[PDB]
Write a protein that binds this ligand. Structure first.
Ligand SMILES: *Cc1c(COP(=O)(O)O)cnc(C#C)c1O
Ligand SMILES: *Cc1c(COP(=O)(O)O)cnc(C#C)c1O
Ligand SMILES: [Cl-]
Ligand SMILES: [Cl-]
Ligand code: NA
Ligand code: NA
Ligand code: NA
Ligand code: NA
Lengths: 387, 384
């Protein structure tokens, strides 16, 4: 038994459906909203759980020329699998690893003057191609970046003394673009104020999903949409303000493997935490918190053949128990997360149950779930355990 | 070839393989006449099923348990020749793959076994090893009545290809006080005593293996305690054995900043300093399994206890620090000690969950760096 060429096999009835056509459709919404901007598709964190390689490849087939990721590992993973678009690493590379970024033609973020000096000291001469750099400006977020104009200017002057270093881009990031209030306006003005005190690079970018949906920002020539490429609004506020429709791309599915009848007194799962009072039927699903369906999901509702059914007892590492009508039997499929916003199984409802935001619900989905990709009538599978 | 031994962000898990071997050896010493069926499901509770199983085989392990056939096949592809039991329910259509790869399966019901027989094509002619699951009170998978148990064995006995290798059950409340565990154990014996006995008889998880002998059983299924964690505080308080925690979660500071009074940090402006205070940016976030709820917890930067402030992002965490902290300083987010403000159990309290889930949350983006004496090995799954 060896690695599959085209589609990985899988041997448990629990999986993610990933709609690639939905993702392309959402990408096309953004390029239509911003027809004179490069759409720098954010595919960090394995494309928010969907699969960075498959998504990037599909987006390239639909005109994408630039991607952003969090780490160099994520960028190298894209390169190993044939992605030839430009890639920006948004996080801070360790200076000792500078030669690997140059070798693989990956653009890096400059967060400070000190970093840039360390990075220069670690350039061996063995990789002689150009190093593309995007300078991060802190305009009030308080995270990564240069916050003062003098330092910004000094960094550009350093880059200009080395023919190997290219000032490719400058960028910032919004803290509160998905809530009402003036902070986003103020950050945008500050960003312009700084960028106007120096020579301008090829790429100027500031907008995440929320900023791309709420503002033009004519000054910028590129956008960095993440979560909304995959079909989710970054907040309720944004969803309510904008008229564009986004298509959710994920379903989370599992099939019932056994049904049982509990008599009054009998309990289910760890800690005897649900005790039957009547004759009630239960269904066992082969999915649990090691898959990202966390323990707190106890008491939520899932969709078994159209019927709304309560998750009862403790969610285990590998199993979930569901209270069901008598007609439910082994083999019936269950929607745990649905590809619709207005659903009791929406990502947002699951997020409310987990006391978190949609972003985290998607990132929780573990390596043990196969991803089954849909592209028209084509179907292919990634199962990380068998790669 | 991959670059899976390399990694390019300063955030990672240290996995102490000697600790794991040490804990395995504790269990075999507590149960000297039993096979220790090491539970390495869910990627060995986040440590890495392949590397752990391989290391345990080097230290005498002959039998493993996993949740799924995918997990079992993953072990076979990477050189594991021990016996493997799949604890979950295989889809009947996939029966030939279990036979081909010499993987034992769980029988949860009489109906499953009939479906499984119907899907045996004849192309894989080796024996199919079966362990019958008995539901003795847990209310999850398995057979709950003695007659059904007997009928299943009688079916297995009519086919030369099917072997009755084992019988087992599982405890619901072995980690809390009360009679339930005793009652389930007696029920298990009562059922097993009404039929011919198989080679393997097993009922004890970590908690059961630490609290009871169960002479009737000849194999144990310890999971979380192999990795150095007690299944509950109750068990920890009752038992005299010492378990060695095997995981650290580490990240290095990538940038420091000084905030003036008024200035804020992260999403939603949830934090403002009001005094000259220094912050450190860590390259780790909730996409790594360090969830948003960790805001307000404490981490260890060069010995100093420091508050996680602001929103935890997908890829970054912000920490309030003393002025002497600088880029490159390492930070312990989870520590390999039980009595630590960074213990797995304290992190579990913060997450309003149990230690099991804290470990399973740790995502594929974190490299695992294994220590075996002075030898070092790295898995970075992105660069397979
Ligand atoms: C995560 C991210 C994004 C995308 O944000 P969303 O569209 O998902 O809300 C854009 N820019 C940076 C930066 C820097 C990010 O870290
Ligand atoms: C998860 C598991 C175990 C191991 O449990 P812990 O020792 O980690 O608490 C043993 N047996 C079965 C079964 C059946 C399990 O699902
Ligand atoms: Cl435009
Ligand atoms: Cl013994
Ligand atoms: Na230059
Ligand atoms: Na969805
Ligand atoms: Na129970
Ligand atoms: Na037989």
């Amino acid at each position: 038994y060896k690695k599959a060429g085209f589609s990985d096999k899988y041997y448990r009835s629990a999986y993610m459906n990933v709609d690639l056509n939905a993702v392309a459709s959402n990408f096309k919404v953004f390029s239509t909203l911003h027809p004179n901007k490069t759409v720098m598709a954010v595919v960090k964190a394995n494309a928010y759980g969907l699969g960075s390689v498959k998504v990037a490849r599909h987006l390239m087939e639909n005109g994408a020329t630039f991607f952003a990721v969090a780490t160099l590992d994520e960028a190298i993973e894209l390169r190993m699998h044939g992605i030839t678009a430009k890639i920006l690493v948004l996080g801070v590379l360790p200076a000792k690893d500078i030669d690997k970024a140059i070798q693989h033609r990956v653009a890096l973020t400059v967060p400070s003057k000190q970093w840039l000096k360390e990075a220069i000291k670690n350039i061996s001469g063995e990789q002689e191609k150009k190093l593309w750099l995007h300078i991060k400006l802190d305009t009030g977020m308080g995270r990564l970046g240069i916050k003062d104009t003098n330092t910004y200017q000094e960094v550009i002057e350093i880059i200009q003394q080395y023919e190997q270093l290219v000032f490719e881009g400058v960028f910032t990031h919004f803290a509160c673009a998905d809530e009402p209030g003036d902070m986003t306006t103020e950050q945008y003005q500050r960003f312009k104020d700084m960028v106007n005190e120096a020579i301008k690079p090829e790429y100027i970018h500031c907008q995440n999903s929320a900023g791309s949906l709420l503002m033009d920002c004519q000054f910028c020539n590129a956008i960095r949409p993440g979560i909304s490429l995959y079909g989710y609004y970054p907040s309720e506020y944004v969803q309510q303000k904008v008229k564009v429709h986004l298509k959710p791309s994920v379903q989370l599915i599992a099939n019932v493997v056994q049904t049982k009848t509990l008599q009054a007194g009998e309990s289910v799962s760890y800690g005897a935490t649900y005790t039957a009072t009547d004759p009630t039927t239960i269904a066992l699903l082969p999915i649990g918190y090691a898959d990202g369906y966390l323990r707190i999901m106890q008491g939520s509702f899932v969709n078994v053949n159209g019927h709304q059914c309560e998750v009862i007892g403790r969610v285990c590492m590998d199993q979930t128990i569901v209270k069901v009508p008598d007609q439910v039997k082994a083999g019936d499929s269950v929607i745990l997360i649905d590809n619709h916003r207005e659903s009791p199984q929406s990502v947002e409802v699951v997020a409310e149950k987990q006391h978190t935001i949609n972003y985290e619900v998607l990132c929780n989905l573990s390596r043990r779930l196969p991803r089954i990709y849909h592209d028209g009538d084509q179907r292919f599978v990634t199962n990380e355990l068998l790669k």
